[PDB]
Design a protein around this nucleic acid. Structure first.
Ligand SMILES: [Zn+2]
Lengths: 99, 208, 189, 83
RNA sequence: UGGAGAGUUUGAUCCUGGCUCAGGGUGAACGCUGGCGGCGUGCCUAAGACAUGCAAGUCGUGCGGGCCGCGGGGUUUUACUCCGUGGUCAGCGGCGGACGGGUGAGUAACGCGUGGGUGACCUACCCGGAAGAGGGGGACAACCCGGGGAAACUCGGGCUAAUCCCCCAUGUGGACCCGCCCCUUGGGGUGUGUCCAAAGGGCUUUGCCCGCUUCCGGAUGGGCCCGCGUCCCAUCAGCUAGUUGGUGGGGUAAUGGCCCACCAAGGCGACGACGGGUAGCCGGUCUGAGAGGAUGGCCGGCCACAGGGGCACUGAGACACGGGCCCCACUCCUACGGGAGGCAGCAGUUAGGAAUCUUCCGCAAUGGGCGCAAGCCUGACGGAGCGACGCCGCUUGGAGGAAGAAGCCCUUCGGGGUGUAAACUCCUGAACCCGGGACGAAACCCCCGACGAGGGGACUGACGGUACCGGGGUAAUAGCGCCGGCCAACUCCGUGCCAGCAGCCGCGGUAAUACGGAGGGCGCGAGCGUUACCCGGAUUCACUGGGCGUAAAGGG
C-alpha cells in the first residue's frame, strides 16, 4: 500500500473545485442574460451577456472549458440573446452583438 | 546422433555393396562376397516378393545409409530440394554430397564416410581458414577444404593421401596431394555419381 | 521471555521461540506441546540440545512423563526437572523428588546427577534461577551448536494465506541464507 | 511526439536494430511509421549500418526528435553533416 | 512445380456407401528411456483466491519548509541568524502516471479486417514560422497550535512562497454573433461590435540557455461516420416505444435519439431482423495439389476488462490495471463505531487441474518517463535458471579384425544366426583441467569550434571468466515402438475362446508369422510410442468436383 499519486488526486480535487466555480457561475450568468432578454431590457442584458462571454473566455484560457467548446457556448448564448431581442430592444450599448 | 553399431549388416540387408568401411568393404570382407544374403536367421531363407512401398523404402534406407545421416536431417534436405527448382532428385543428391563429410570422403581425406565425419568433428578439417567441426556443413561450389594446420602431420591422414596418391578424383573435385588441400569445384550432378540408388523411388516414397 | 499475553490452551502453535539471557540466547520449543506421541522414536535426530521435565503438584509423574524422559535420554540430554504449581496449597515437591529418586534420578541436594528447580506458574517465581541453572549446564556439558556443511530439521509443515507452503526449520549446523537450493526428505527447492 | 528510434529485433546475443521513425508511446517493437535504416551493433557485416539520408532529413524537418543513440548513428552515417 | 492409397458388408463379384488406418502438425500431456549445445517456448483449465518482495516516477535549473551535515562568521557559550553548500525528508507546483506490461471473460458489434470520409473534429510534448512576455493583488499546502478518533486518519484557527490563482493593460492574433464576398453542408477571406494572453528560473548575467503565452502550418496520435467482408441454429418469425424521423434545446473536441421536450408513426424483417448458443478480431499459423477447411499460442496491430456492477473528476488524451467515489461479494484487522484491500505486472502461494518455469541478476544495450544536466527510476526489456515442451546441431568412436570364440538362440544335427559385432591391435580425443579471453559500447559527458557542423578525450558489462581461441587430455549414455493384412520386419518356447492384444478386419477353445517371453529383424534415435484435437486421405457437403428408376435421396 501507499503511493505518491495521492498528490495528483489532491491536485485534481482543487482543480475540480475551481472548475466548478468557473462553470456554475458562468451557467448562472448565462441564465440571467437569457432572463433579461426575455422581456426586452436590452442594455443591462447586453452588459450581462458581455460579462458572461468574458467569463467563458477566461475559463477557456485556464484549464476549464478550453478549446472550441467555449466558443460554441458563446455562440449559443449570443444567438439566443439576439433572437430574444427580436421581441423588442435592438442593440443599445453596441455590446456583444455584431452591429 | 549417428546410426552407431554394426555396419556391414546394413549392406547385407540391401544386397548391394555399400562401401561403409572403405577397406575390407573393398576386399573379400564386406560380407557382400563371403555371404551375400540379409542378416539374421531368415536371411538365407526364401526371399518373398516385396510390396511397391517396400522396395522404395529399402532404396531410401540404402541411400541414407550410404550418406550416413539421421532420418530427420535427410527429410529436411529432401524438403529443401523440393522447394528449390530443377530436378528434385539429382539436385537433392548434389545437396547431400555437399555435406562436408561426404566431400572429405570423396577427396580421399579419410577412407570411410563415418571416418571422414569423425575427422571433421575433431577439428582436423578446415574450410577456407576456419577449422569446421560439423559434417552438416553445406558447401556452395568453388570452395576450399584442407587438412588442418595441426593435423597435417598425423599418420592416418598420410595413409589416406597415399591411398589416393595415383587414383583419380571426381570431375566436381580437385585435390592438392602435396599440401593436403582440396577444392570443391562444380556441384556434383547425378550423372557424375554411379550410385546404386534410384532417386525416383525415394521421391515417390517421400511424396505421401 | 518478552511479556505480552497468554495464547490459550490450544494444541497447535507456530514454532520455537528464542528466550534472551545475559550470557546468550536459549531456544525454547513451542510446537504442538503434548505430541500425543507424534513419533515413538524418530531415528535419533536430537531435536533439542537439552530437555526440561515439567511435573504437576496435582498429577505427579505420569506414563507420558516417563516416555518424554526416555525420549530425552535417547536424544542425549542431561535432564533438568521442574516442579510446577508450588503457590497452590496442594503442592508437594518432596514427594515428586522422592518419586524421581525411585525412578533413578538423584538431585544435587541429596547428592547425584539430576537438577531440581521448583517453579510457580502464576505469580512470577524462580524463572531467572532456572535460566541461570540451564546456562550453567550448557557451559558444563559443552552443548554448543557454521563454516561446516549446513544441516537443519523440520519441526512442522503448513499452509498460509499470507505465504504458501511453509516449513518451520530449526538449524543444527551452518549458515542458511535466502536464495539457495535445499533438499529435505524427497521434497526440495 | 514523433521520434527517430532504434527497434531491437534479431536473436539473444545477436541483436539487430532498426533505425526507424515512430511515435514515442509505442512498443520498442511496435507499429512504426517508416523504416529509414538499419544497424548491427556486432559490426559483423561490411555494410554493417546503413540509413537513407534524405528521408531522415525530411523527418527531422517535420519534427522527428531522435533518440541519442539514434542521433549518433545518423551523425556517423552523414545526415546531420551539412555544407 | 503439384494431387500415391489400403483393410472392411459377400460363398465369390460389382458398386453405393459409412467406419478405420497410414501423412503432417500442435502453447500439448502421459509412459519408458535420457548425453550435451544453440535457439525458440511454457496455467490452452477457475476471469478462482491471493502473502511477501518489487512492477511509476521524477524535477532543488519552479517554490517555501523541517532534519541533519560543513566553510565562515555575526554570535563568549548557547541559541538565533546569514549565505554558499551536501544530502535527506515530506509538502506545494509542473510534467508523466491514458505509454509500457497482462488477460481474452464478455462483446457476432462499425468490434475488427478492409477502403474511404471528417465543410463534423481534437492533438499536451515535437518541429516550422509569427507575435509577445507591462503592472498590481490574492489565497493554499507544508508549518505552528488546538482538538476528535482504537486505527484509518481527520476537522478548526493562524502563517508563508511559487511557473498556484486572480485582475487590469496591450492584440501579432484568435474567439463569437451579424453582414458581405468566394466556396460549397460548419471551408476560406473581410467589416462593425464584444471578449481573450502569459511566468519564471539558470548561469560563463548585458549575454545566452531552459521554460513561458496566443496563433497559424506541419507531424504523429486518435475520436467519430459510412461502402463491403465477418460462426452455428428456422425446432428463434415477427421484433421495436427513445423505437424510426422531425423541430427546438441540452451535452460533446465534434455529428448523431447521445440525452430531453414536443410533433409525426414510423423503423427493421425470410437478401434472415429479433432470440439462443457460441466466439475477442485480424496480420497470421497448421493443413491442402490447389480451391477450401480448422485455429487465432508466441510475435505485431486494434478492441475490451482490470472481484462484479455503476458513475463521474483531472487533464492533450481516461470513464483511468498498481487514481477516485458508491453499492454488493469476499479476505483482513477493530476499543463493534469503522477502515484496509484486489497479482487478468514479474516471481511465487495455493485451488482447479493430465499439465506449465526462478519469490533470479542487471540498467550494461535498446526503448519509456522526468530532468539543462549529471542522473534517478524501469519485473518494458536484456539475460541467466528449470522443463528433450518444440525445432535444429553434435557426441555415444574410427580404422583394422574368423570361412567365424564365448554367451545366447534356432536346427532337418551337418549346420545356421547374432556378426566385423565383440575381444584384441592401431588411431582420433566429447567430457575434463590449465592459459588467455571477447564482439555487443559509443555515445549522452567535458574541452576546442558559436552550446551548429566538425575534432579529440574519457568513463560505462547483468550475460560472464561465458562464448570462443591456445595447450593438454579419457573410448567416453542407447533407448523406444513394432514385427497377421494395411505396414518395413519371423522363428521358437510357454499359454489353450483362459490369460491377453486390438486402430480396423479380427486373433486366442493344444504346432498361435496376431497373446507372454526369448532370440532375430525392421523403423526411428536422444528419443520413440500412446492419448487429445485439427487438417489430410474425405470428390464422405463435392465451387474446382457427387448425386437422387432399384442404393440415402424427387416434395402427392
Ligand atoms: Zn561392408
Amino acid at each position: 500500500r501507499n503511493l505518491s499519486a495521492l498528490k495528483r488526486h489532491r491536485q485534481s480535487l482543487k482543480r475540480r473545485l475551481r472548475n466548478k466555480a468557473k462553470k456554475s457561475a458562468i451557467k448562472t450568468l448565462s441564465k440571467k442574460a437569457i432572463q433579461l432578454a426575455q422581456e426586452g431590457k436590452a442594455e443591462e442584458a447586453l452588459k450581462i451577456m458581455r460579462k458572461a462571454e468574458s467569463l467563458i473566455d477566461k475559463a477557456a484560457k485556464g484549464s476549464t472549458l478550453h478549446k472550441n467548446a467555449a466558443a460554441r457556448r458563446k455562440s449559443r448564448l449570443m444567438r439566443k440573446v439576439r433572437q430574444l431581442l427580436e421581441a423588442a430592444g435592438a442593440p443599445l450599448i453596441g455590446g456583444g452583438l455584431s452591429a | 546422433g549417428r546410426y552407431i553399431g554394426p555396419v556391414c549388416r546394413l549392406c547385407r540387408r540391401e544386397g548391394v555393396k555399400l562401401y561403409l568401411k572403405g577397406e575390407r568393404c573393398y576386399s573379400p570382407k564386406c560380407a557382400m562376397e563371403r555371404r551375400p544374403y540379409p542378416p539374421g536367421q531368415h536371411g538365407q531363407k526364401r526371399a518373398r516378393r516385396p510390396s511397391d512401398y517396400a522396395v522404395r523404402l529399402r532404396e531410401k534406407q540404402k541411400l541414407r545409409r550410404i550418406y550416413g545421416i539421421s532420418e530427420r536431417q535427410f527429410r529436411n534436405l529432401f524438403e529443401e530440394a523440393s522447394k528449390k527448382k530443377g530436378v528434385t532428385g539429382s539436385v537433392f543428391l548434389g545437396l547431400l554430397e555437399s555435406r562436408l563429410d561426404n566431400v572429405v570422403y570423396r577427396l580421399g581425406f579419410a577412407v570411410s564416410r563415418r571416418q571422414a565425419r569423425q575427422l571433421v568433428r575433431h577439428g582436423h578439417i578446415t574450410v577456407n581458414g576456419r577449422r569446421v567441426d560439423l559434417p552438416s556443413y553445406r558447401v556452395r561450389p568453388g570452395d576450399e577444404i584442407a587438412v588442418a594446420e595441426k593435423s597435417r602431420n598425423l599418420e592416418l591422414i598420410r595413409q589416406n593421401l597415399e591411398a589416393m596418391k595415383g587414383r583419380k578424383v571426381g570431375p566436381w573435385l580437385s585435390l592438392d596431394v602435396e599440401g593436403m588441400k582440396g577444392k570443391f569445384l562444380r556441384l556434383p550432378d547425378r550423372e557424375d555419381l554411379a550410385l546404386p540408388v534410384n532417386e525416383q523411388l525415394v521421391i515417390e516414397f517421400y511424396s505421401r | 521471555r518478552i511479556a505480552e499475553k497468554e495464547a490459550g490452551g490450544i494444541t497447535q502453535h507456530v514454532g520455537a521461540f528464542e528466550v534472551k539471557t545475559p550470557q546468550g540466547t536459549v531456544v525454547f520449543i513451542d510446537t504442538p506441546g503434548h505430541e500425543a506421541f507424534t513419533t515413538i522414536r524418530q531415528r535419533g535426530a536430537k531435536v533439542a540440545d537439552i530437555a526440561v521435565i515439567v511435573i504437576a503438584a496435582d498429577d505427579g509423574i505420569m506414563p507420558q512423563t516417563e516416555e518424554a524422559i526416555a525420549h530425552a535420554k535417547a536424544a542425549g540430554a542431561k535432564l533438568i526437572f521442574a516442579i510446577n504449581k508450588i503457590d497452590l496449597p496442594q503442592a508437594d515437591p518432596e514427594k515428586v523428588k522422592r518419586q524421581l529418586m525411585e525412578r533413578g534420578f538423584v538431585p544435587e541436594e541429596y547428592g547425584g546427577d539430576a537438577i531440581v528447580i521448583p517453579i510457580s506458574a502464576k505469580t512470577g517465581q524462580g524463572v531467572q534461577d532456572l535460566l541461570e541453572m540451564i546456562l550453567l549446564l550448557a557451559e558444563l556439558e559443552d552443548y554448543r551448536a557454521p563454516n561446516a556443511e549446513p544441516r537443519g530439521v523440520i519441526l512442522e509443515s503448513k499452509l498460509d494465506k499470507q505465504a504458501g507452503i511453509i516449513a518451520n526449520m530449526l538449524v543444527q549446523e551452518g549458515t542458511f541464507r535466502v536464495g539457495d537450493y535445499v533438499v529435505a526428505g524427497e521434497a526440495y527447492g | 511526439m514523433v521520434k527517430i528510434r532504434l527497434a531491437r529485433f534479431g536473436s539473444k546475443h545477436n541483436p539487430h536494430y532498426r533505425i526507424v521513425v515512430t511515435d514515442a508511446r509505442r512498443k520498442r517493437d511496435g507499429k512504426y511509421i517508416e523504416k529509414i535504416g538499419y544497424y548491427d551493433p556486432r559490426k559483423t557485416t561490411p555494410d554493417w549500418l546503413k540509413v537513407d539520408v534524405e528521408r531522415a532529413r525530411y523527418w527531422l524537418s517535420v519534427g522527428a526528435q531522435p533518440t541519442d543513440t539514434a542521433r549518433r548513428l545518423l551523425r556517423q552515417a552523414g545526415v546531420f553533416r551539412q555544407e
